[PDB]
Curated annotation (Swiss-Prot):
Name of encoding gene: MB
Taxonomic lineage of the native organism: Eukaryota, Metazoa, Chordata, Craniata, Vertebrata
Location of the Globin domain: 2-148
Modified positions (Phosphoserine) in chain numbering: S4
Organism (species): Physeter macrocephalus (Sperm whale)
Record's protein name: Myoglobin
Coiled-coil zones: none
Family: Belongs to the globin family.
Subcellular location: Cytoplasm, Sarcoplasm
Keyword Phosphoprotein among UniProt keywords: yes
């Protein structure tokens, strides 16, 4: 697929608002993900012992991971489709070391969209949401293809 520039502009415009508080957004998104799809929490050895959302909010480690995840995603979206290099190490670690199925990347894509929708309604109307969804579907499509070359496809 290929986004138009206009679509990239809608995606990077709301992203610039996310970047005003990267740790807060990273917490909100990971907690929305673990509440909605608790099985995903099992992939995190360091955190699968967290029992409630209060514990998750209080975890310093969880907040640090959130910033790591959002910072890598932001770097990929800022490429505007030219993200082959950025994707290579990401695909390798998520396919061989962590073993994250494509289905789980769809789940965090749903959590990202839910959080931007609640925190940025003015910059995340239907056209902006459609553009962010296209950008995350492109991201998932390119990572799924890399998973296949690497021998995981899952
Ligand atoms: C928007 C998509 C995501 C991005 C951009 C991303 C980014 C990252 C990055 C940059 C790291 C640190 C270096 C590395 O190991 O690659 C990481 C680690 C990790 N990620 Fe992902 N990730 C994403 C989705 C997920 C999902 C959906 C899961 C599981 C449901 C996941 C599981 C993990 C695990 C288990 C680690 C190691 C955490 C720790 O160090 O204990 N990631 N991820």
């Amino acid at each position: 697929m290929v986004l138009s520039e206009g679509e990239w502009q809608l995606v990077l415009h709301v992203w610039a608002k996310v970047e005003a508080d990267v740790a807060g957004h990273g917490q909100d998104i990971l907690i929305r993900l673990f509440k909605s799809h608790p099985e995903t929490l099992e992939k995190f050895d360091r955190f699968k012992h967290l029992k409630t959302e209060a514990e998750m909010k209080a975890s310093e480690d969880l907040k640090k991971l959130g910033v790591t995840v959002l910072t890598a995603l932001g770097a990929i979206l800022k490429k505007k489709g030219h993200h082959e290099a950025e994707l290579k190490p990401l695909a390798q670690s998520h396919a061989t070391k962590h073993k994250i199925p494509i289905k789980y990347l769809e789940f965090i894509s749903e959590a990202i969209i839910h959080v931007l929708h609640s925190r940025h309604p003015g910059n995340f109307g239907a056209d902006a949401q459609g553009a962010m969804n296209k950008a995350l579907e492109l991201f998932r499509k390119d990572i799924a293809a890399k998973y296949k070359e690497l021998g995981y496809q899952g």
